[PDB]
Swiss-Prot record:
Phylogenetic placement of the source organism: Bacteria, Bacillati, Bacillota, Bacilli, Bacillales
UniProt binding sites for Ca(2+) 1: D57, D59, Q61
Source organism (scientific name): Bacillus thermoproteolyticus
Residues annotated for Ca(2+) 2 binding in this entry: D138, E177, D185, E187, E190
Gene of this entry: npr
Presence of keyword Secreted: yes
Keywords, in A-Z order: Calcium, Hydrolase, Metal-binding, Metalloprotease, Protease, Secreted, Signal, Zinc, Zymogen
Entry protein name: Thermolysin
Binding site for Ca(2+) 3: E177, N183, D185, E190
Length: 316
């Protein structure tokens, strides 16, 4: 809508207070005009009809419990935009400042979030397995990163290319969490998963096997569930990313860590320059090795750690 840019305040899902960019025109709307062609957050109103209604508020304060998921979807979309802009010089997911749109209160008791080809969508969870999913910065950045992937490499959501697609979303979700310094870790979804139970998460990058995901290629899932294991086999790549950044010894192979910034630059380059829609794990290794060579030279430590890390997870 057309109006005056202003700043509202509200409380997110975890009860923290934050300022959000709004637009005023009779009502205050969750429309942030400060970022690209805008960030827009919608109320799906417990239905499945998308996007629903652009979020309107009478007084520019967002402290109702019903408001909380909209506050975080709006705020964390902004943070994720800032990460791609400031760190990788990328303007929104398409590179040309496309409007970022999210809907919250999707369906009833819905324990997931997704990118639907055009926008992000967040369920409220059922209160036991999940609380509203936009509460996790790593979840929000995970979903938006699918948009970045679709516009760059175009990784198919199937089999190994699909597991690469998922891993890229976990990797950048985690790097965004670190960038925002929101109690960061190498776990996925810990902030919104099983509110009754502390210390768990949906997936682990530092140790995938903790929740039964493979941490080595010899352990890959080869069946048909989960589109050929796109959320399961991503563990193999997630462990590799973790090793490249943090270092460690895994199945007897030692890896010297090169840090998160370099992990990010290497994988952003592989994604936007060398990956293709049908890329498999072996090609991801080649892409990532070629990216580190481009950036740091063929005899650098950075190329060596990338090779070490893929060796460690059995990807040749
Ligand atoms: Ca209000
Ligand atoms: Ca965290
Ligand atoms: Ca996390
Ligand atoms: Ca939990
Ligand atoms: Zn995903």
């Amino acid at each position: 809508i057309t109006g005056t840019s202003t700043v509202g305040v509200g409380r997110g899902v975890l009860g923290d207070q934050k300022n959000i960019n709004t637009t005023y025109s009779t009502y205050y709307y969750l429309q942030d005009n400060t970022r690209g062609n805008g960030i827009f957050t919608y109320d799906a109103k417990y239905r499945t009809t998308l996007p629903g209604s652009l979020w309107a508020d009478a007084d520019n304060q967002f402290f109702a419990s019903y408001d909380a998921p909209a506050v975080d979807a709006h705020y964390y979309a902004g943070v994720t935009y800032d990460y791609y802009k400031n760190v990788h010089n990328r303007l929104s997911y398409d590179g040309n400042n496309a409007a970022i749109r999210s809907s919250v209160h999707y369906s009833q008791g819905y324990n997931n979030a997704f990118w639907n080809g055009s926008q992000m969508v967040y369920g409220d969870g059922d209160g036991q397995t999940f609380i509203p999913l936009s509460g996790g910065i790593d979840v929000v950045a995970h979903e938006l990163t699918h948009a970045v992937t679709d516009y760059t490499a175009g990784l198919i959501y199937q089999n190994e290319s699909g597991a690469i697609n998922e891993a890229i979303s976990d990797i950048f979700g985690t790097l965004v969490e670190f960038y925002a310094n929101k109690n960061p870790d190498w776990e996925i979804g810990e902030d919104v998963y099983t509110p009754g139970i502390s210390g768990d998460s949906l997936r682990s990058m530092s140790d995938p096997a903790k929740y039964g995901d493979p941490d080595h290629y010899s352990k890959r899932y080869t069946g048909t569930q989960d589109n050929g294991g796109v959320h399961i086999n991503s563990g193999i790549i997630n462990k590799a990313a973790y090793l490249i950044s943090q270092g460690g010894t895994h199945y007897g192979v030692s890896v010297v860590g090169i840090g998160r910034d370099k992990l990010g630059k290497i994988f952003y380059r592989a994604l936007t320059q060398y990956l293709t829609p049908t890329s498999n794990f072996s090609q991801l290794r080649a892409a990532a090795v070629q990216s580190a060579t481009d950036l740091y030279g063929s005899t650098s430590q950075e190329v060596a750690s990338v090779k070490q890390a893929f060796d460690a997870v059995g990807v040749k």
